[PDB]
Design a protein around this nucleic acid. Sequence first.
RNA 1: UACCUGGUUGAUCCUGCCAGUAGCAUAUGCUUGUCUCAAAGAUUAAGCCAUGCAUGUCUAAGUACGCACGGCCGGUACAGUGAAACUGCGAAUGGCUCAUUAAAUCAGUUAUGGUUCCUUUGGUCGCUCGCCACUUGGAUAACUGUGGUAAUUCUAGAGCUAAUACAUGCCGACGGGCGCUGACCCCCUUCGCGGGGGGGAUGCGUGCAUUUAUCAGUGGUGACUCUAGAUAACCUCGGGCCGAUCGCACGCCCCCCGUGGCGGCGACGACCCAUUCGAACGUCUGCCCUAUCAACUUUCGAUGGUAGUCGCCGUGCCUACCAUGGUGACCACGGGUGACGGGGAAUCAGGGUUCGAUUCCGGAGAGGGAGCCUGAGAAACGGCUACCACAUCCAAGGAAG
RNA 2: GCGGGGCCCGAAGCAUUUACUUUGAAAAAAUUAGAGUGUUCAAAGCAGGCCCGAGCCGCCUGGAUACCGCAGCUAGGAAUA
Lengths: 153, 259, 118, 204
Amino acid sequence: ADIQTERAYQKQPTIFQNKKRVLLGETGKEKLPRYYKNIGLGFKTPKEAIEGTYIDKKCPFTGNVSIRGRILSGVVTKMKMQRTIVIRRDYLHYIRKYNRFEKRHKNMSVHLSPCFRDVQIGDIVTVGECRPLSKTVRFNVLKVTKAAGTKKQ
Amino acid sequence: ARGPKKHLKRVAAPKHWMLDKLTGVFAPRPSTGPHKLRECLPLIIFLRNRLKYALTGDEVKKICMQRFIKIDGKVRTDITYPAGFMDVISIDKTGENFRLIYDTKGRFAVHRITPEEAKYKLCKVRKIFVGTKGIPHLVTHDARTIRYPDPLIKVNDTIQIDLETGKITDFIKFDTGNLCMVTGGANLGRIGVITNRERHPGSFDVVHVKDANGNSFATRLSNIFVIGKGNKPWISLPRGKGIRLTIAEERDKRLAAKQ
Amino acid sequence: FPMKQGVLTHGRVRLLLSKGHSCYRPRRTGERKRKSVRGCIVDANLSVLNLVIVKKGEKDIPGLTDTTVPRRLGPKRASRIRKLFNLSKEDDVRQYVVRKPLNKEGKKPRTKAPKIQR
Amino acid sequence: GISRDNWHKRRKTGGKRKPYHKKRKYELGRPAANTKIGPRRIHTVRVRGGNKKYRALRLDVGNFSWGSECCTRKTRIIDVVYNASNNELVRTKTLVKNCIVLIDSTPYRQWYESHYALPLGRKKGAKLTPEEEEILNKKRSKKIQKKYDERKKNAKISSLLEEQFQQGKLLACIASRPGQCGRADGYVLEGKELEFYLRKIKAR
RNA sequence: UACCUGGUUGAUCCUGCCAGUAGCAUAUGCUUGUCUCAAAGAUUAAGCCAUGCAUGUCUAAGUACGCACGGCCGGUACAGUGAAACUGCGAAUGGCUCAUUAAAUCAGUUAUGGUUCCUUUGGUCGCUCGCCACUUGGAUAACUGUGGUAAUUCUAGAGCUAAUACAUGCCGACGGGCGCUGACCCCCUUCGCGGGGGGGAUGCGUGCAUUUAUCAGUGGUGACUCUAGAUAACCUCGGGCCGAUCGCACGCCCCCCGUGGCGGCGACGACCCAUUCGAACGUCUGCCCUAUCAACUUUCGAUGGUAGUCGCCGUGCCUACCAUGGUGACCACGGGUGACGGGGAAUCAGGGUUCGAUUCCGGAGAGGGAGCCUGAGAAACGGCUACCACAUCCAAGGAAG
RNA sequence: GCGGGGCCCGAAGCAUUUACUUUGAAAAAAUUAGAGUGUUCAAAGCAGGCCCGAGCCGCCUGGAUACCGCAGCUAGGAAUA
């Protein structure tokens, strides 16, 4: 339930929390101001990046990462691995000797921010790129767009 | 490899310098300076190929060590000095006063100017920013920075600064309708009025340019250099007037003047 | 192999010497070089040893502690020429410089003075 | 000759990649400074660009910040009490960035007394003659007593934080990078953050 | 030129290969008169190398106290020419080779909003409130004079002497302003009152750059935790700048007052910003043969999550603590390559096939591995240190590759 | 974009999403294909050309253009899949 589950105090490095809890500022109604930003190239900010309560350095909507560069799209093929999913971008490569195409793929590890809930197996996700985040994770999840759902019994 | 390069091979040189193939292995290798080196043209081959005041590389030095070769009103004595675009040279003894302008085939032109229009030059700005203690700065096409500019001067604006004073005389704003010169890509050397500025957020911004003779074209925004207010240039143009001719239309205008 | 202050070991060791220790003048900047240098303790395995008086005692050894050689290059910077001749202040350094005599045979007998510094 | 490059790692599939050049100089040797509490030893190493970094071999004081009432003072460092990255960096008293450090309370006490004129740390009284009975009264004027008696709004502190003004030492957190810049700055723990770390020391 | 001809049979039509034919590129054979361009120890040995060389460098302008020369123009600082040596700057380029190397290099593409940059330009360089400044302090080379070695660009001792070397350090600006403080304002509501203000006595701090915390939201971008502004403080002794430098024509005020004050063109250094040359690290896509190479990677990081350490910055790049992941028949993993990659070359109906050590761009490496110093830039090799391999001189003590 | 009207049209949603196609940028020379020029010719080379009546401060002019795959960046088309 709670957020402080690591072994250091997770917080956002920019907002200041402890602003003079006195007889004016009561501990009965206690929020903290939530830092988010906006990405350009027409990408909205999900409600759970504003009214959410999580913490992620690597989230594009509350961390210190900035998308600029290529923008791609893929299919979520494996959703293990906390805050980092694997997506597969299938494509066709053209061999001009045989005048035909060749169904290739290469999959790619991307940082899934926890401002997205209904990210299940086989969904379409547009993905932007940034600085290197890990050994292999260079790209970052901007906007899921669902598949295979909207009614399940 | 382990550091910077300071030779340049002759077949690796920019071909709008119009070099030989058999006179040597090496290239003039322009010095570090205000201009990037693929765009520019050094002092050596300007006074032994473009003007023929010299025959060797030694003859360029013994004119340039007598301290009358004035690049933008300043005596620069190194013979590999990067000149660049829109700068005035000043021989000052036989008084030629060239300005470096592209012709419509992408090449720098031997191009005289009057001894009082020579007193200034024009500069596209590449960045405007606020400096320390809150004062504005701009940095230009060449390396020249100016403090306290007129606050209407945004990015990709063209200002006019005079030599020997160094301050902004008149600025002229990048607007649709103004008269630009393209200094990059396959269309450079042509001169035409701006049609529209169609933005791309995150990508490269491309503008469309109509000439004075209907031939419309387009280059990206980092190639555009405004030198006119609507229809008249602020500088002296060369022959051709920034109008590319087709290879059949170049044919008869070349072979009827040899009548 | 010339001796070095600071070995405290009789024999011959090999030091890695940079610029400025002793017994190694380099050839390019930052070059270090390993050279075999002899220790600071004395033995009987010495071809010559240098030896410096700190006190004259009884009498004159002929040709060793007499015949005072003239320091023909005097002070040049204008703060040791003020300290040598006890110039108090603003006492016109340009007057009180030393001047060296010159006595070639085929040329007229000159005299040379330095520049000044500071 | 310890390097920091990726071309000795096994790649994403799991394939051994064969090295295609010697190790270069921009993967320069990376030893640790291990800044620890003592007198002040600072060492300087030239880096690329000809620049310097001041690596801190031994540290004495800090420049810790207060934040909630906006105070920064020099203060000496007592102890390292908890580290999140390693519980073995606290048995050897080694200053790193996000370790909870322990400093004293004297410059913040005399700040809080020179601005609000309240006692602070005091539990029994009856020894406050030499520099404490004088400061809270001082024979002020009229309008100073006006502007100081209205300060009964921003004078109260949450009970976890003045309890450790009483018995001597305040625990804080370094925010600087010692061994890299050569300073140990930081902020004083307070708030829900302080409840977090006071549990994570009490649980040790 | 979108091309065929001879050979299985007693003849025939086929299938099929063989041989012919034509380029071009290595070697060789025979032969060779003239003249234009002209590859040329790549393949096997990235085998080994005698000897000689290919990286050094003075302006009017850092340091001449060598007679090495000068008219020693004259009773004294230096008419200049200058070797030598210090200082500075290059020596990280070019040149050579193709051994390594199969998403590696490389190519196009796009980034650094995640960083470094001697130089070049162009900015900034009285913004700091603080008993030598008309100039402070200590060495050292060449030089002189003794030396040691069989022998090296080996150098020891003693005496001198210089700085733009190596350091210490000040005047003026500088009158003050600002904020935090703060012994009288009494004129306000002294009616018992509560007062509303500006002010002074006072002591701190005060620029840029660095480090941390906080506050507000000039100039920008698609977009910041940007740029700028505000407050509280730091400032590393192997300590950030805030000129103890050198030439040229000499001139101006001269009222203190014939000695004091001011000036033109430069030349060097100089934190920081931007430029330039880049360098490094990333993104997307693209590589030959092999399954007689089908599972691989993870104690020894394999994939990811936190926190840090160092690095010029992003990051399992490392360390600790966790999670159990990553890749693969759309060929992973392993092997081979007579594999440096590319622009390109030979070919010529179209589709293709083959070659590309080789002058251009990029990479890599100097006998094989490794570790470093100097410097802006090197894991440098016509730099160093060591080991392995080969090899030189020796007076056999050592030297140099 | 000529707090509530007219010759007026930008920003906004691209209201499935891709392949496919056309367009436009951007893509180092040398080499190739090719323009010009009697190197005496040719291979090459990027030069050269014109009258001296001496004013001849010497005049005129070249050093083209096309092709740079596939992948990305644009704008359009929506048969086919």
